[PDB]
Structure 1
Amino acid sequence: VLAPGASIFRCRQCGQTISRRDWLLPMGGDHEHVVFNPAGMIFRVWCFSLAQGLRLIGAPSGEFSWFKGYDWTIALCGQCGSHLGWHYEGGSQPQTFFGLIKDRLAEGPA
């Protein structure tokens, strides 16, 4: 389609380019996963094969992982430090991917 308006995801706080609709990844059959952390925070997580503009913090941990076989690291916006989701590694098919918090991204035109 000409002039699409739902093609790129940016950080909601600062506008840093983060990912693309084209890179949505249907993990376990769905790109959306509704999950909670040990602090009880509920997230609507969209899985992406690739992302950019993030900064991954700390060492990978398997503890409390929402995706079996994957270890996670916190993914912050590399520009503003907003916590945008997690990077997953150490699994299979794919080895790595990103789980990003949908409401912390803004979707818009390329």
Structure 2
Amino acid sequence: APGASIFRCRQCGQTISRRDWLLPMGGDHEHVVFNPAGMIFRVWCFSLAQGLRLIGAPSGEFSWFKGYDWTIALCGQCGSHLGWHYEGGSQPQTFFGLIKDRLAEGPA
């Protein structure tokens, strides 16, 4: 009866990811970054996610991860901005960077 195994959208409950899918990119699953507007994000990297809607085509502009292009990842249910999908890189080619405090963790 694990209580901390699934991540859901904090706004609506959409199933998004799993603790088992956390990915230590450069040795840590947690990365703290700012966008050009100075907004701080505490980002968890996941090998896999579901329930998102990836918006538009990838961009390398101001990418926080060397060699990856990003696409905005909304909650596919409620449209909450949950993070980014990264692609175009190497080992791995793709991953998800999700904003920790926009998810809720709970039982399967």
TM-score range, shorter chain: over 0.9
Provide the TM-score with structure 1 as the length reference. Answer: 0.98
User: Within 1, Cα distance between the matches of 2:72 and 2:36?
Assistant: 14
User: Within 1, Cα distance between the matches of 2:99 and 2:64?
Assistant: 13
SS at match of 2:101: helix
Q: Unpaired runs of 5+ in structure 2?
A: none
User: Within 1, Cα distance between the matches of 2:47 and 2:35?
Assistant: 22
Tell me how far 1:12 sits from its aligned partner: 0.2
Superposition RMSD on alpha carbons, in Å? Answer: 0.3
Tell me how far 1:37 sits from its aligned partner: 0.3
Tell me how far 1:15 sits from its aligned partner: 0.1
Tell me how far 1:85 sits from its aligned partner: 0.1
Pairs aligned (count): 108
User: Within 1, Cα distance between the matches of 2:66 and 2:105?
Assistant: 28
Counterpart position of 2:26: 28
Tell me how far 1:58 sits from its aligned partner: 1.1
C-alpha distance after superposition, 1:74-98 (max 9, x if no partner):
0000000000000000000000000
C-alpha distance after superposition, 1:53-81 (max 9, x if no partner):
00000110001000000000000000000
Q: Unpaired runs of 5+ in structure 1?
A: none
Counterpart position of 2:91: 93
User: Within 1, Cα distance between the matches of 2:12 and 2:85?
Assistant: 20
